[PDB]
């Protein structure tokens, strides 16, 4: 009974998301070391200390969806992997959304976005596991609604973590019927 509205990993990086600032913040990457290609948005500016990097989805038409479920899969590297990053490095990132009736296109205005939650890893990836290609994939799900406008965006804010976002799946549950 689920209807999928957005599926980053299945789209092969063709979804055309928006980054702000463009360049040096979140970057679209692929890993092809495994059976299935892996796609991701990732950032790792853990030494600077003044990071405010944003990632916004394409516009998603809501249709009949009222409550939307947002499933994220991601890795976070241990801040202790980076020497002298005690104050600059973080281990969380933030999830936001915005409802709208039109597509704003390339105009990203973070002032229109509402925070859903801080997203934190149950498992951090330490250096030895990173170097051996054994990353720890975390899964976090949140829901919001009822939605009331024609469409919505999700956005992701990085504040100085070493984070790879590998899956973003948004779905709703079809109305229950009495057989």
């Amino acid at each position: 009974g689920e209807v999928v509205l957005l599926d980053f990993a299945a789209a092969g990086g063709e979804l055309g998301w928006l980054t702000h600032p463009y360049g040096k913040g979140w970057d679209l990457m692929q890993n092809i070391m495994n059976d299935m290609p892996i796609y991701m948005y990732s950032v790792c500016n853990v030494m600077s200390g003044d990071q405010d990097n944003w990632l916004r989805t394409n516009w998603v038409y809501r249709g009949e969806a009222e409550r939307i479920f947002i499933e994220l899969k991601f890795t976070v590297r241990d801040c202790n992997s980076f020497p002298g990053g005690a104050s600059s490095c973080k281990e969380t990132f933030n999830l936001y959304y915005a409802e709208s009736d039109l597509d704003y296109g390339t105009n990203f205005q973070k002032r229109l976005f509402t925070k859903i939650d801080t997203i934190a890893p149950d498992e951090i990836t330490v250096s030895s596991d990173f170097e051996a290609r054994h990353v720890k994939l975390n899964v976090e799900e949140r829901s919001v609604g009822p939605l009331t406008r024609k469409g919505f965006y999700l956005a992701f804010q990085d504040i100085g973590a070493c984070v790879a976002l590998l899956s973003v799946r948004v779905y709703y549950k079809k109305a229950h019927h009495h057989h």
Partner: peptide
């Protein structure tokens, strides 16, 4: 530093 091993820009 990199967030994910063997990742290459698209």
């Amino acid at each position: 530093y990199s967030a994910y091993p063997d990742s290459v820009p698209m």
